Amino acid sequence: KVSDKRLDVDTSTIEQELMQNKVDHNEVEEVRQITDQDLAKIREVAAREDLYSLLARSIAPSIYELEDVKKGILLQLFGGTNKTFTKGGRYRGDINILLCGDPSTSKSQILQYVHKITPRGVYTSGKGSSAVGLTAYITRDVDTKQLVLESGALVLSDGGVCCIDEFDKMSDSTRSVLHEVMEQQTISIAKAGIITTLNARSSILASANPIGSRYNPNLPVTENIDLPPPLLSRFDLVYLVLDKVDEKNDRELAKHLTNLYLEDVLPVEFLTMYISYAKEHIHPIITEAAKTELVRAYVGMRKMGDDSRSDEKRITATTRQLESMIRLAEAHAKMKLKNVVELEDVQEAVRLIRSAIKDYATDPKTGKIDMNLVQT
DNA sequence: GCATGCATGCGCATGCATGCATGCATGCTGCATGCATGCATGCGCATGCATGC
Q: Which nucleotides of strand B are protein-proximal, with an atom < 7 A from a CB?
A: 10-13
Give the CA distances from residue A129 to residues A23, A108, A169, A183, A210, in Å, rounded to whole numbers and listed in that order.
41, 18, 11, 21, 21
DSSP 8-state secondary structure symbol assigned to residue A210? P
3 state DSSP class of A338 = coil
Radius of gyration for the alpha carbons in chain A, expressed in angstroms and rounded = 22
Do A270 and A129 form a contact (C-beta atoms < 8 A)? no
Nearest to A319 by CA among A293, A294, A283: A294
Nearest to A194 by CA among A122, A132, A121, A128: A132
The CA distance from A305 to A303, in Å, is 6
Q: Is the CB of A192 under 7 A from strand B?
A: yes
Q: Which DSSP helix (H) or strand (E) runs through A351?
A: helix A343-357
Q: What is the dihedral of CA A185, A190, A196, A201, to 10 degrees?
A: -20
Q: Is the CB of A195 under 7 A from strand B?
A: no
The CA distance from A247 to A251, in Å, is 6
The A 72-131 residues near strand B by Cβ under 7 Å are: 130
Q: Which residues of A are annotated as a binding site?
A: 101-108
Query: Reported resolution in A?
Result: 2.8
Length A130 CA → B9 C1' (Å): 14
The CA distance from A173 to A121, in Å, is 22
Task: Please state the φ and ψ torsions of residue A238, each to the nearest 5 degrees.
Answer: -120, 120
